[PDB]
Amino acid sequence: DRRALRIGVNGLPPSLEPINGISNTGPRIINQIFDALIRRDYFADGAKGNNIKLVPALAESFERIDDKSIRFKLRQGVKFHNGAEMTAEDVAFTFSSERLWGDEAIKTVPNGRNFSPNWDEPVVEDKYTVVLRTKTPSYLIEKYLGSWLGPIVPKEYYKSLGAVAFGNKPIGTGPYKFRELVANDHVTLEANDGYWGDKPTASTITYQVVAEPATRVAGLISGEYDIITTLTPDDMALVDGYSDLETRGTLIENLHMFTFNMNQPIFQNKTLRRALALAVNRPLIVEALWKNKASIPNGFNFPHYGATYDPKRKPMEFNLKEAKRLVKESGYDGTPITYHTMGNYYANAVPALMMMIEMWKAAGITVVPKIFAPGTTPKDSDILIRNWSNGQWLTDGLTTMVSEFGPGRGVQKRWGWKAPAEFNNLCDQVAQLKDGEERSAAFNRLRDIFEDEAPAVLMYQPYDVYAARKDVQWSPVSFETMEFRGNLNFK
Numbered sequence: 001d002r003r004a005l006r007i008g009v010n011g012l013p014p015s016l017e018p019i020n021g022i023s024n025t026g027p028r029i030i031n032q033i034f035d036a037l038i039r040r041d042y043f044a045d046g047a048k049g050n051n052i053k054l055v056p057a058l059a060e061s062f063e064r065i066d067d068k069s070i071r072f073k074l075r076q077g078v079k080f081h082n083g084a085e086m087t088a089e090d091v092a093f094t095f096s097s098e099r100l101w102g103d104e105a106i107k108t109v110p111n112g113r114n115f116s117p118n119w120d121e122p123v124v125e126d127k128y129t130v131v132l133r134t135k136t137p138s139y140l141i142e143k144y145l146g147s148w149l150g151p152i153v154p155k156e157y158y159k160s161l162g163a164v165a166f167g168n169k170p171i172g173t174g175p176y177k178f179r180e181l182v183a184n185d186h187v188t189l190e191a192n193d194g195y196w197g198d199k200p201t202a203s204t205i206t207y208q209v210v211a212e213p214a215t216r217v218a219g220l221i222s223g224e225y226d227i228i229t230t231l232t233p234d235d236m237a238l239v240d241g242y243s244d245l246e247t248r249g250t251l252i253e254n255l256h257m258f259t260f261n262m263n264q265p266i267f268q269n270k271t272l273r274r275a276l277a278l279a280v281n282r283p284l285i286v287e288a289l290w291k292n293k294a295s296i297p298n299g300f301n302f303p304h305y306g307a308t309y310d311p312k313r314k315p316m317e318f319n320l321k322e323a324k325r326l327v328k329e330s331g332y333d334g335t336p337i338t339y340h341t342m343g344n345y346y347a348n349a350v351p352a353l354m355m356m357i358e359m360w361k362a363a364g365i366t367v368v369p370k371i372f373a374p375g376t377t378p379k380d381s382d383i384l385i386r387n388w389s390n391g392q393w394l395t396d397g398l399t400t401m402v403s404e405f406g407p408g409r410g411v412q413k414r415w416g417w418k419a420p421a422e423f424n425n426l427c428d429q430v431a432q433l434k435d436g437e438e439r440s441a442a443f444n445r446l447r448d449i450f451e452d453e454a455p456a457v458l459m460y461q462p463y464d465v466y467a468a469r470k471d472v473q474w475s476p477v478s479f480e481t482m483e484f485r486g487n488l489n490f491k
């Protein structure tokens with residue numbers, strides 16, 4: 001018979017509503033309850049969980065009909081876990097102004113517009129045909145629909161509960177249905193044997209919260225968990241030493257960085273930001289703390305961007321002499337500069353910060369750690385430097401250089417980055433351009449402006465480490481989620 005699967009997790013998301021649950025901990029549950037119109041086929045063509053190939057999922061087929069619209073022909077007879085049939089009304093509601101990107105929608109789905117292209121209202125043409133469209137040109141609609149924005153929600157059930165209550169009792173069409181949630185303790189899912197895709201291989205999946213990695217590792221050894229999440233390379237020797245267990249790691253499409261509150265006088269100008277960027281010996285941090293498993297990106301540039309990945313782009317430079325030169329040009333007077341970090345919320349954050357403080361001290365810059373406890377929210381006027389992480393969530397270069405650092409977004413509006421006019425004009429263009437030499441050249445120009453301006457300093461692409469009992473065949477994917485479709489067998 002099928003075995004129950006137990007996953008020892010770092011935590012649970014604030015909600016299981018597909019958008020509001022977007023976090024380091026939500027997608028690994030959400031991916032099981034819901035399906036999107038398009039699925040990223042991570043293991044296609046022998047790829048090691050990193051293929052960017054998008055394949056139809058709830059959409060039987062789709063045809064792009066112009067630079068801003070796609071007509072989807074949906075699978076018919078597919079049911080949500082409540083017994084309701086999925087139709088074009090459910091898909092239109094999922095990406096409607098009412099639920100997702102209108103002004104009232106973002107009161108209960110705050111990131112609905114942030115994670116969306118410039119949508120126009122979906123058009124339901126018949127029971128199973130829906131045109132999803134943007135107001136302005138967008139050759140990124142397919143990638144958005146294959147991203148964490150994509151999960152299809154049941155209109156009648158979602159509308160009767162609202163986004164918050166739906167988040168505590170989600171209903172989707174996915175291989176595993178929601179059974180129960182005990183806040184910050186566990187989520188249990190059950191096999192959806194009415195699933196339109198392959199039969200689920202686990203009878204139940206339990207995500208059990210174990211805050212401390214050491215206790216997660218104990219639980220795996222003891223037989224409490226079959227898989228455990230959120231380990232670092234340092235934990236690999238202990239786990240791999242057991243003949244019944246093994247680590248399963250992968251580079252993830254996330255970016256660890258530090259950024260500045262550019263409203264502060266010292267960071268209004270690019271000079272000290274550039275001095276702080278050029279003084280970081282990123283290879284040293286990667287060798288010492290990540291066992292050379294983390295990757296330094298060659299600019300704001302990753303292979304999963306696809307046509308907008310530039311493999312020939314030169315690496316970001318460590319130039320202590322040029323950093324010292326810029327410290328003098330900035331007029332820095334030795335006042336201590338705080339670096340806000342919520343402990344090791346981002347893996348190895350305090351150890352990396354302690355190494356960077358010494359690199360900054362070498363360039364003649366005094367940076368002091370301000371390790372704020374979790375839950376606390378330091379006010380903006382108190383932040384000088386702060387660590388940040390950005391999930392590189394589309395299989396495209398738009399996210400996050402354009403989505404986070406673009407015009408009207410946080411880095412410019414809230415954190416005062418006065419980006420050069422060409423950067424904002426190229427940001428607007430790459431959202432609308434089709435992939436080609438113009439689009440690829442514009443991203444390289446945006447990358448050059450980003451490095452020149454230093455609104456943030458890219459540290460590295462982290463290496464995520466899972467551990468599992470060898471009798472559970474399951475491979476990680478290059479994203480902060482877990483995929484069990486064609487990837488979960490009990491030996």
Ligand code: NA
Pocket residue numbers: 228229230231464465466
């Ligand atoms: Na993990």
